[PDB]
Design a protein around this ligand. Structure first.
Ligand SMILES: O=S(=O)(O)OC[C@H]1O[C@@](COS(=O)(=O)O)(O[C@H]2O[C@H](COS(=O)(=O)O)[C@@H](OS(=O)(=O)O)[C@H](OS(=O)(=O)O)[C@H]2OS(=O)(=O)O)[C@@H](OS(=O)(=O)O)[C@@H]1OS(=O)(=O)O
Ligand SMILES: *[C@@H]1O[C@H](CO)[C@@H](O)[C@H](O)[C@H]1NC(C)=O
Ligand SMILES: [Cl-]
Length: 351
């Protein structure tokens, strides 16, 4: 009874990679006008061979066929006030990641093509369906997501805001929370052939991906870059400046996924400097992001983990930082970035 319940999209042309219906999990809180829509992450695949291995080995991320009927909300999706001090009573939605496209895909596939990439269409579908189940009464819609879902937020939040403005819902304030989705298009520590998904350099992964997924990026970002250079917009620091919606960025200064795509594994001095500098460059990209939480840890994702309340930056927890931000949009710091130079120089890093 306390769990989020699955609904498969009515529009059966909007699908996961394998053509099974996409969907969303929902727990209504009928006395609340706040809505949390969470986009799941889990990498991506950018060519046929790699999508084949992902289908063999990680079918969950390509198909709805085995999704369970319900799932328990955790972290910012929990309905327990101890676990979720300020958002426990919100309406909760979890949108599973079954498009492998960083939530960017916007075409119905060709029959010639074998996988469908419909991440951007899923989100809009889910939003439309929600309108008939309570979202029509919302005042705040926080679009949140972790890892590829955090990148998804940056790519989709202004489109959700535009969609709701266009459909006649001017009172719904659309906001984003991007967790572990803020990446650097940097040079790898040691350069790889781009042969597996997880070790392909981040610039090349998106360059290929965007073409393979027929991915879309926010128009205001696309305009800033030359034709063919849309890949730039998958990078938080490049897409953020033109976002109209308020967006709170949560980012570990040493994200495990960043180190993975940078082909990084007492460390030798070259490797020490590359790591320190990675932390430094990330810190620098967050300088002009007033609402951010960036601890000096090597970790990945946080907002739906049960222990998300434990990490602190300058004495402030993440749920508290987020509450300060909420209050500012409706003494309470919202800009919280570690300055220490090595992973786990913050005592409160998760394990
Ligand atoms: O349980 S809820 O999910 O509805 O959230 C309750 C808390 O939401 C706030 C917003 O907090 S903030 O975003 O951090 O700033 O306000 C919302 O609830 C209050 C009180 O409603 S309640 O049923 O008595 O809890 C609403 O006020 S009122 O309509 O009853 O006058 C706010 O609506 S409004 O701004 O007046 O339109 C409502 O905001 S919203 O509609 O969700 O955007 C907190 O209240 S606040 O501190 O006054 O801003 C609530 O905190 S509380 O301790 O639970 O009261
Ligand atoms: C179903 O979604 C498909 C693919 O996006 C779209 O072409 C079609 O218009 C949709 N139909 C309805 C009735 O929503
Ligand atoms: Cl129902």
């Amino acid at each position: 009874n306390e769990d989020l319940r699955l609904h498969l999209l009515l529009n059966t042309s909007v699908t996961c990679n394998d053509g099974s219906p996409a969907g969303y999990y929902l727990k209504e809180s009928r006395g609340s006008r706040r809505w949390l829509l969470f986009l799941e992450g889990g990498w991506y695949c950018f060519n046929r061979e790699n999508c084949d291995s992902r289908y063999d080995t990680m079918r969950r991320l390509m198909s709805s066929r085995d999704w369970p009927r319900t799932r328990t909300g955790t972290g910012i999706l929990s309905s327990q006030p101890e676990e979720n001090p300020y958002w426990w009573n919100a309406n909760m939605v979890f949108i599973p990641y079954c498009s492998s496209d960083v939530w960017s895909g916007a075409s119905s596939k060709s029959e010639k093509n074998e996988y469908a990439f419909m991440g951007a269409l899923i989100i809009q579908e889910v939003v439309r369906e929600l309108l008939g189940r309570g979202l029509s009464g919302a005042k705040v819609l926080l679009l949140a997501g972790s890892s590829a879902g955090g990148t998804g937020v940056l790519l989709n939040v202004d489109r959700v805001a535009e969609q709701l403005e266009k459909l006649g819902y001017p009172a719904i304030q659309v906001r984003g929370l991007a967790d572990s989705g803020w990446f650097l298009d940097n040079k790898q520590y040691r350069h790889t052939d781009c042969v597996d998904t997880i070790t392909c350099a981040p610039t090349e992964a998106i360059r290929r991906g965007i073409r393979y997924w027929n991915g879309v990026v926010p128009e205001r970002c696309r305009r800033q870059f030359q034709e063919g250079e849309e890949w730039n917009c998958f990078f938080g620091y490049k897409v953020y400046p033109t976002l109209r919606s308020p967006v709170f960025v949560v980012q570990w200064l040493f994200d495990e996924a960043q180190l993975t795509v940078d082909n990084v594994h007492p460390v030798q001095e070259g490797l020490r400097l590359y790591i320190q500098n990675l932390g430094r460059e990330l810190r620098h990209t967050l300088k002009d992001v007033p609402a951010s939480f960036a601890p000096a840890c090597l970790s990945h994702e946080i907002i739906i983990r049960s222990h998300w309340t434990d990490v602190q930056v300058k004495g402030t927890s993440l749920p508290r930082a987020l509450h300060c931000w909420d209050r500012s949009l409706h003494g309470c710091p919202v800009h919280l970035v570690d300055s220490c130079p090595w992973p786990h120089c913050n005592p409160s890093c998760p394990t």
